Structure 1
Amino acid sequence: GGVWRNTEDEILKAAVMKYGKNQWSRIASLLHRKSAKQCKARWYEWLDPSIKKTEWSREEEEKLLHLAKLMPTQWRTIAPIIGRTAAQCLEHYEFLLDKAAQR
């Protein structure tokens, strides 16, 4: 299911602080539900300290609305180019801005 509540997010933050980056079985060894694939998936999808998980700018939105017209799907190719880079934060932006350009 992969629900990822807070009491495992903070333990994952502690584990990545202790063990490292390319070492995921050793920190899935202490979570009782999760495998190492799900640990990689969250720590690069939600818990990465480089993720600017708020603050929608104005430069990146005028960037993506004619960056997601170049390659129309593919929000994992244009995720590092935007650098909002969660690859669904981009999809949140694009569906919100095509609601606000419709209303």
Structure 2
Amino acid sequence: MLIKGPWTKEEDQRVIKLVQKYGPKRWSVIAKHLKGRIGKQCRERWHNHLNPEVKKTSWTEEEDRIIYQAHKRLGNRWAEIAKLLPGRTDNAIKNHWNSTMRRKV
């Protein structure tokens, strides 16, 4: 039967409302309503740039300058960079770098 695979439909529609109600710090409970997409699955879709709580402004200049600096000293510490960078959680700035800025300017 259908299980795992891409994350959408009865996936976002759940975490999307459950996060705005509880918050991204109860993945253990959030998971219970996602049927099989438990524990980590919910976190995977989220904590990146999905959070409707942060409009998809994306990288351009005022943010593209972050990786160029933040990574230059704390790149391998995406967790703290992300914390000091509201919006792009510990995943957006991580994959962005290793795809877009994969040249360590």
Between 22-31 and 59-68, the greater mean CA deviation after superposition: 22-31
Query: TM-score when scaled to structure 1?
Result: 0.63
Whether contact under 8 Å (1:64, 1:82) holds in the other structure is: no
Q: Distance in 1 between matches of 2:85 and 2:95?
A: 13
Please state whether the residue corresponding to 1:67 is helix, strand or coil.
Answer: helix
C-alpha distance 64-30 of structure 1, shift in aligned 2 (>3 A): closer
Query: What are the residue-to-residue correspondences of 1:49-68 with 2, within 5 Å?
Result: 49-68=52-71
The residue aligned with 1:35 is 38
Percentage identity across aligned positions? 27
- Higher RCO, 1 or 2 (CA under 8 Å, sep at least 6)? 2
Structure 1: gaps of 5 or more residues: none
Larger radius of gyration: 1
1:10 deviation in Å? 0.8
* Counterpart amino acid of residue 15 in structure 2: L
Query: TM-score when scaled to structure 2?
Result: 0.62
Structure 2: gaps of 5 or more residues: none
1:11 deviation in Å? 2.5
**Matched positions, count:** 99
1:90 to 93, 101, 104: 93
Q: Distance in 1 between matches of 2:87 and 2:16?
A: 21
